[PDB]
């Protein structure tokens, strides 16, 4: 994900510094159709989850999208290995097992496609509209990394390719978090675990195969994956092995929240606060000749993005690693 957003960034830089290719001359249809496909994908894919949530809450499981109810079979997801029936085991563990795809896999894969397409939309818009646009016609003169062009024309905030990356990084992080959660839950529920005894084995999975039944709802994701599987990391303080992981969980939550400061606030408030503070220093004759300044707009965005991504990644890192370490030992 990080290197893909990087490729988008440096594509934008190349467009700014050099002449672009001729596919930029019909950029409006390209980005328009990408916008439409993003909207349609998000609507359908996420609204299936929302429909499942609402109907299940109302008490109508027969109306939801699931294997027992209306089912969205992934017809195109076909085997190619041609493996023999069964699973491969090694000393009380399942080294290899076929992943069986159903409505949950259909829904999660289309969520993946939606998020990938939205990230691609942000990156491609930044690349194609880097030199100029209907809003501002001298974006090339403005450069690559500028905060805006002004409050004019309604407001030209984050029109630069740098800001387009600044948003595409958020979207890449969202996509990768969903991918990580999908992989983690699916592997725990349907692949990993132990077995209990031509011989037939009953496979006891770590998550107990709850992905196919609970993953069909956002509430199921919230309960069976985050809340239920955060027991290890949340209750890791006394345990010698993973107390560090619990503390890092807490600290990553703190850092992620602290990023919202920079992501929501603006330069002028902090500059005025700094001046008011500096009044007292000048009063007491503490005169810093490297005059304090509030972080620039682009720097504030960068700091917020860095802290946001780092905190989220740290929370996920600690959560998954604590769960795995405890379960395997």
């Amino acid at each position: 994900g990080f290197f893909t957003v990087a490729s988008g960034a440096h594509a934008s830089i190349f467009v700014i510094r050099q002449l672009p290719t001729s596919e930029i001359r019909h950029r409006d249809p390209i980005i328009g159709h990408l916008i439409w496909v993003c909207i349609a994908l998000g609507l359908h894919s996420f609204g299936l989850y929302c429909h499942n949530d609402t109907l299940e809450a109302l008490g109508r499981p027969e109306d939801t999208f699931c294997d027992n109810s209306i089912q969205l079979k992934p017809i195109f997801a076909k085997q190619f290995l041609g493996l023999q029936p069964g699973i491969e085991v090694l000393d009380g563990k399942i080294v290899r097992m076929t992943q069986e795809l159903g409505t949950a896999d259909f829904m999660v894969h289309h969520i993946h496609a939606f998020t990938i397409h939205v990230t691609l939309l942000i990156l491609l818009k930044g690349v194609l509209y880097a030199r100029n646009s209907r809003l501002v016609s001298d974006k090339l003169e403005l450069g690559f990394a500028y905060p805006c062009d002004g409050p004019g024309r309604g407001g030209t905030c984050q029109i630069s390719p740098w800001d387009h990356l600044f948003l595409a990084v958020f979207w890449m992080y969202n996509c990768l978090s969903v991918v990580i959660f999908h992989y983690f839950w699916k592997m725990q529920s349907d692949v990993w675990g132990s077995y209990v005894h031509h011989s037939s084995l009953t496979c006891s999975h770590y998550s107990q195969g709850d992905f196919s039944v609970n993953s069909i709802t956002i509430n199921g994701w919230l309960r069976n994956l985050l809340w239920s599987e955060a027991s290890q990391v949340i209750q890791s303080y006394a345990l010698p092995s993973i107390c560090s992981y619990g503390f890092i969980f807490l600290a990553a939550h703190f850092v992620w929240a602290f990023s919202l400061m920079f992501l929501f606030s603006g330069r002028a408030y902090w500059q005025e606060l700094i001046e008011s503070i500096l009044w007292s220093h000048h009063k007491l004759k503490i005169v810093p000749h490297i005059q304090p300044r509030a972080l620039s707009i682009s720097q504030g965005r960068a700091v917020g993005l860095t802290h946001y991504v780092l905190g989220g990644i740290g929370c996920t890192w600690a959560f998954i690693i604590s769960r795995m370490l405890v379960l395997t030992t």
Binding site: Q271, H282, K285, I286, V287, H289, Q291
Partner: protein, 73 residues
Amino acid sequence: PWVGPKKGSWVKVLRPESYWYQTRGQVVNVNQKPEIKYPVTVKFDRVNFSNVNTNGFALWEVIEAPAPGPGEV
């Protein structure tokens, strides 16, 4: 004769909207033309938010002050 402060002398800026309001700068020059509304030119060691070091002030927006001491603006 010299209408404004002497060249090189320190003057305290009395323009309320100035970044250097109530602080002192050095009189770079004074325009002797009577038709100049803001003849005095004052430079300050502290650049304002626009990274500007000097400015023009009227004769009533600057008063003569001693040179800043240690730790004084």
